[PDB]
Amino acid sequence: MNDALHIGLPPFLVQANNEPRVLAAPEARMGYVLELVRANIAADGGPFAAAVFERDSGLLIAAGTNRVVPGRCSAAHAAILALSLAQAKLDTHDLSADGLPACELVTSAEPCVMCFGAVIWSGVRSLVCAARSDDVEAIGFDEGPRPENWMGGLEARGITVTTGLLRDAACALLREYNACNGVIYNARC
Amino acid sequence: GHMNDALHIGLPPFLVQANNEPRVLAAPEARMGYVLELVRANIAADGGPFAAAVFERDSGLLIAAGTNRVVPGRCSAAHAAILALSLAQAKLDTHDLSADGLPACELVTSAEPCVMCFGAVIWSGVRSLVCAARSDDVEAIGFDEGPRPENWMGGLEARGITVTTGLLRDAACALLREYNAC
Ligand SMILES: Nc1nc(O)c2[nH]nnc2n1
Ligand SMILES: [Zn+2]
Ligand SMILES: [Zn+2]
Structure with a gap:
C-alpha cells in the first residue's frame, strides 16, 4: 500500500494473534515463540519470532515474526512486529x-x-531472549553496532534482561534454516 | 489502525499526498526544505515534530516520506525514518x-x-543520510535518542552510508522550539 505502512501477516501469525493463550512459565512462553519460528521459516520468513506477554499472568498479547523479505520491509523484524501489533x-x-x-x-x-x-521505546519492562548474539551472527545475520553493554543499558532503563532461555533449541532452528538458505534445490528442505 | 491480518500504520492526508506527488529536488537544501515542510504539517496533524524522506541521491527524485506518528498511530516504532524507509521499500x-x-x-x-x-538506516539499503537538527537539539525539547553506539556517525560511514548533518539546522530548530512552546 502506497497510502500507509502495511505489513501483512501470514495465516499462522494471524492465528497466533487471534487465539487466547496463557503460558505461565518462561520455558512455556519461549517454547511457543520457537514454534512460531519454525512456522515462519515454512512461511517464507526469517528464522526469528517474538511475542509480547503480560509479565505477571502469562497472557499472550501479540506475536510477531521476521517478514523482511516477503514484506518488502527491512524494518519488519520479529521484535518490532510483536511490539507494534501489541500496541x-x-x-x-x-x-x-x-x-x-x-x-x-x-x-x-x-x-x-x-x-x-525498539524495545527501549516499547514500554515493555522485561526482555527474554533465546539465542545469543554470537549464535545469530554465526550463521550470517548481523546484529549491528549496538552500544557497549547494551544489556546493562536496558536494566538501567528499568528493563530486566534474560538470555539463553531454550538456547539449544533456538540454535537448532537457526542452523536448519541456514542449511536451506541456498539456491540449489534440496528435497529434504 | 488495528487489524488482524496486518500491521497497518495509517497516514494523514498531507503524507499520503507527499508519497504520491511527483517531486524532484536536486539541491540538498531543496530536499531538506521540503522535509521541514512535512514537519510543520505533521505537527498540525497531531504527530511529533519529525519528518524524513528518501530521495534518489543524484537526481533528487522524491521516493517516499515519513513522519513521527507515534501517538496518533499508537506505535512507538512509528518514527519519521522508519516509515519513510519502509514506504520507500x-x-x-x-x-x-x-x-x-x-x-x-x-x-x-x-x-x-x-x-x-x-x-533501521543501516538495514535499509540507503547509501546517504542528511540531517538537519542535531541530537542535543532533539534532547533539548524532551525527545530521547536512546543509547546509541560510541560514534554512531562513524558506524554508518563504516557501512557505506555517508553522513551529512547540520543542513538547515537553524530552520529545523525553529520548528522544534515552536512545537515545544505548544
Ligand atoms: N528521538 C525521536 N523521537 C521520536 O518520536 C521520533 N520520531 N521521529 N523521529 C524521532 N526521534
Ligand atoms: Zn532486529
Ligand atoms: Zn527514531
Missing part, C-alpha cells in the same frame, strides 16, 4: 501506560541494534 | 534499497536518528 491491540504507543499490566517481550534471538532501540 | 518493491540496478538512495531527515532509527 495496536492495546490501543496505545506505551505498553507501560497507566492502566496496563507490565509487558514482557519474549524473543527467539537477542535483539539487533534496531530492535534494541 | 514498498514503492520500489524490495526490502533492500541498495539492490542491484536500483539507483543510490538517500534519507533526508529533520533530526539525527535515535538508536532505533540508527539501525
Whole structure:
C-alpha cells in the first residue's frame, strides 16, 4: 500500500494473534515463540519470532515474526512486529501506560541494534531472549553496532534482561534454516 | 489502525499526498526544505515534530516520506525514518534499497536518528543520510535518542552510508522550539 505502512501477516501469525493463550512459565512462553519460528521459516520468513506477554499472568498479547523479505520491509523484524501489533491491540504507543499490566517481550534471538532501540521505546519492562548474539551472527545475520553493554543499558532503563532461555533449541532452528538458505534445490528442505 | 491480518500504520492526508506527488529536488537544501515542510504539517496533524524522506541521491527524485506518528498511530516504532524507509521499500518493491540496478538512495531527515532509527538506516539499503537538527537539539525539547553506539556517525560511514548533518539546522530548530512552546 502506497497510502500507509502495511505489513501483512501470514495465516499462522494471524492465528497466533487471534487465539487466547496463557503460558505461565518462561520455558512455556519461549517454547511457543520457537514454534512460531519454525512456522515462519515454512512461511517464507526469517528464522526469528517474538511475542509480547503480560509479565505477571502469562497472557499472550501479540506475536510477531521476521517478514523482511516477503514484506518488502527491512524494518519488519520479529521484535518490532510483536511490539507494534501489541500496541495496536492495546490501543496505545506505551505498553507501560497507566492502566496496563507490565509487558514482557519474549524473543527467539537477542535483539539487533534496531530492535534494541525498539524495545527501549516499547514500554515493555522485561526482555527474554533465546539465542545469543554470537549464535545469530554465526550463521550470517548481523546484529549491528549496538552500544557497549547494551544489556546493562536496558536494566538501567528499568528493563530486566534474560538470555539463553531454550538456547539449544533456538540454535537448532537457526542452523536448519541456514542449511536451506541456498539456491540449489534440496528435497529434504 | 488495528487489524488482524496486518500491521497497518495509517497516514494523514498531507503524507499520503507527499508519497504520491511527483517531486524532484536536486539541491540538498531543496530536499531538506521540503522535509521541514512535512514537519510543520505533521505537527498540525497531531504527530511529533519529525519528518524524513528518501530521495534518489543524484537526481533528487522524491521516493517516499515519513513522519513521527507515534501517538496518533499508537506505535512507538512509528518514527519519521522508519516509515519513510519502509514506504520507500514498498514503492520500489524490495526490502533492500541498495539492490542491484536500483539507483543510490538517500534519507533526508529533520533530526539525527535515535538508536532505533540508527539501525533501521543501516538495514535499509540507503547509501546517504542528511540531517538537519542535531541530537542535543532533539534532547533539548524532551525527545530521547536512546543509547546509541560510541560514534554512531562513524558506524554508518563504516557501512557505506555517508553522513551529512547540520543542513538547515537553524530552520529545523525553529520548528522544534515552536512545537515545544505548544
Ligand atoms: N528521538 C525521536 N523521537 C521520536 O518520536 C521520533 N520520531 N521521529 N523521529 C524521532 N526521534
Ligand atoms: Zn532486529
Ligand atoms: Zn527514531
